[PDB]
């Protein structure tokens, strides 16, 4: 139950505005930025600011604030999921969404803010379906806009029939200062890129633990998907029945499912770091990075960030493998390894100075956070088994998959 979808800039003036109910005055956004700067200096910052009877649900984009005002008891999660879907629709029409895109494309953005939401209710937000009658380059609305299958326009014909899948892992990790693992979970996301012709009814098959326990294959390697968040397209009642993934895919890239499970396996890249921070003199980083995973796999282009003090000076970097650049913007060293094979153990020694006059304020201790990437490897052990293309016409498509292991928030705390 939004009232007025505003789009601001970093100065607080209105890039574009679109009210629906009129319960919030159009000059109420002038009280957003002073209230945000007031709440900023007392630590009571919130995504829901308050000006009397006008609440400001807002998110922060690159240079943009998408304030969505409201007056009554608005459904808040509706408003925020609406705002991030508006961000996704604008970033699918526009290659980037900045201040230079609003004031140069106001022909289509008022049309979109009239089309996506009426009276405060989202009604049609699939951007690929929305490309068919709201163009920047008008016909009748397609039947896909009204029909139950509202994410796939019938009549799309390709030359080939390629089904691309990206079972991309993302290891989250949080190792404390003692050297023990606090939280280690994997947020994986199967990301498809569908090039199919017709109205296919795919049936994706996984090695789910519940499906194998109800099948009778309960001694092979099966992933215990602790939670799965499918897309809109997946028939969720049939998935709750017998763990079956049946859907009609959209046209283009999308995120099908987002599984999330825990990990009692060792961390992939371990960062055994020690810090000899002598006061007023210098600091030594005799850090090493061993790879606990298999010997075969090859971690491409990892970036092991290690936070340094704010005012370090005259760096020296005695490494073994992989160069060191020193980024004083983020105030951390970026120990970039180009190729990091499994089973190895690379040592690196950084050595700064430190000013002899002491600091005025505190410093804070951000974690060591790597940016690794391992192809052809799944930490979860999920294995897609099949993908039955079902089409009334009848053809053979080529389903392709690749497995990538990335990081999420792969943080390791310091002392």
């Amino acid at each position: 139950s939004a009232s007025a979808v505003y789009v601001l800039d970093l100065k607080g003036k209105v890039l574009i505005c679109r009210n629906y109910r009129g319960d919030v005055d159009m000059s109420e956004v002038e009280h957003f930025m002073p209230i945000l700067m007031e709440k900023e200096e007392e630590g009571m910052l919130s995504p829901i600011l308050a000006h009397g009877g006008v609440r400001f649900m807002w998110i922060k984009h690159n240079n943009l604030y998408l304030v969505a005002t409201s007056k009554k008891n608005a459904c808040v999660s509706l408003v925020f999921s609406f705002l991030y879907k508006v961000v996704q629709v604008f970033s699918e029409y526009f290659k980037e969404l900045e201040e230079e895109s609003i004031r140069d494309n106001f022909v289509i953005i008022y049309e979109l803010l009239d089309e996506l939401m009426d009276f405060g209710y989202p009604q049609t937000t699939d951007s690929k379906i929305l490309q068919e009658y709201i163009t920047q380059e008008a016909p009748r609305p397609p039947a896909t806009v009204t029909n139950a299958v509202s994410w796939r326009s019938e009549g799309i014909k390709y030359r080939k029939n390629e089904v691309f899948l990206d079972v991309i892992e993302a290891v989250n990790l949080l190792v404390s200062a003692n050297g023990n693992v606090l939280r280690s979970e994997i947020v994986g996301s199967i990301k498809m890129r569908v090039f199919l012709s017709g109205m296919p009814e795919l049936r994706l098959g996984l090695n789910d633990k519940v499906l194998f326990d109800n099948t009778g294959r309960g001694k092979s390697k099966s992933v215990e998907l602790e939670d799965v968040k499918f897309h809109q397209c997946v028939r969720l009642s049939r998935f709750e029945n017998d763990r079956t993934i049946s859907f009609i895919p959209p046209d283009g890239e999308f995120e099908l499912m987002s599984y999330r499970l825990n990990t009692h396996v060792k961390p992939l890249i371990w960062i055994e770091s020690v810090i000899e921070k002598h006061s007023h003199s210098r600091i030594e980083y005799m850090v090493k990075a061993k790879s606990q995973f298999k010997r075969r796999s090859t971690a491409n282009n990892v970036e092991i960030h290690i936070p340094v003090p704010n005012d370090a000076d005259s760096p020296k970097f005695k490494t073994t493998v992989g160069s060191v650049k020193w980024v004083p913007e983020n105030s951390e060293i970026v120990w970039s390894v180009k190729s990091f094979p499994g089973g190895k153990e690379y040592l690196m020694r950084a050595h700064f100075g430190l000013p002899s006059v002491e600091a005025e304020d505190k410093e804070g201790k951000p974690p060591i956070s790597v940016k690794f990437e391992i192809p052809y490897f799944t930490t979860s052990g999920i294995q897609v088994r099949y993908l039955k293309i079902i089409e009334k016409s009848g053809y053979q498509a080529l389903p392709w998959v690749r497995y990538i292991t990335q990081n999420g928030d792969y943080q390791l705390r310091t002392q």
Partner: peptide, 13 residues
């Protein structure tokens, strides 16, 4: 992405 795919079976009969 410079990574290459692997084809999956269709039916898993």
């Amino acid at each position: 992405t410079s990574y290459d795919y692997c084809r999956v079976p269709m039916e898993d009969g």
